[PDB]
Amino acid sequence: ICKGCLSCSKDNGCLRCQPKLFFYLRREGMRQYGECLQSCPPGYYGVRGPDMNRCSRCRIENCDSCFSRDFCIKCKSGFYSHKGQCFEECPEGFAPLDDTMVCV
């Protein structure tokens, strides 16, 4: 009924996931239902909490895959990571490397 849960609520769904899974929120009714996932969806990154791990929307431009809120571990194929972000051309002060895609 709630899957991979440790406390399950008729209406808001799972409120505490089993240690290995990722809490994911979504709409059921106007309410927010909570799930417990194997890994996160797409556009979502893992977040190791002290109580529980949870999924969170990646909000970096041109980022294939976040690592934290402000830090992209993978920029869109063909894009220059710099200071967490992913950029078209390196900004004033910086330039790429010997085939890295990283501003200096």
Author numbering: 39 to 142
From the paper:
Rspo (R-spondin, also roof plate-specific spondin) proteins are evolutionarily conserved from fish to humans and have well-documented roles in a broad range of developmental and physiological processes resulting from enhancement of canonical and non-canonical Wnt signalling. ZNRF3/RNF43 specifically targets these Wnt receptors for ubiquitination and turnover, hence reducing Wnt signalling responses. Direct extracellular interaction with Rspo proteins inhibits ZNRF3/RNF43 activity. Here we report a molecular level analysis of the ZNRF3/RNF43 ectodomain structure and its interactions with Rspo proteins.
We therefore engineered constructs to express the region spanning the two Fu domains of Rspo2 proteins from several species. Each Fu domain comprises three β-hairpins rigidified by four disulphide bridges, similar to the cysteine-rich regions found in members of the epidermal growth factor receptor family. The connection between the Fu domains shows considerable rotational freedom, allowing a 50°–60° variation in the relative interdomain orientation. This prominent loop presents a solvent exposed methionine (M68) at its tip, which we term the ‘Met-finger’.
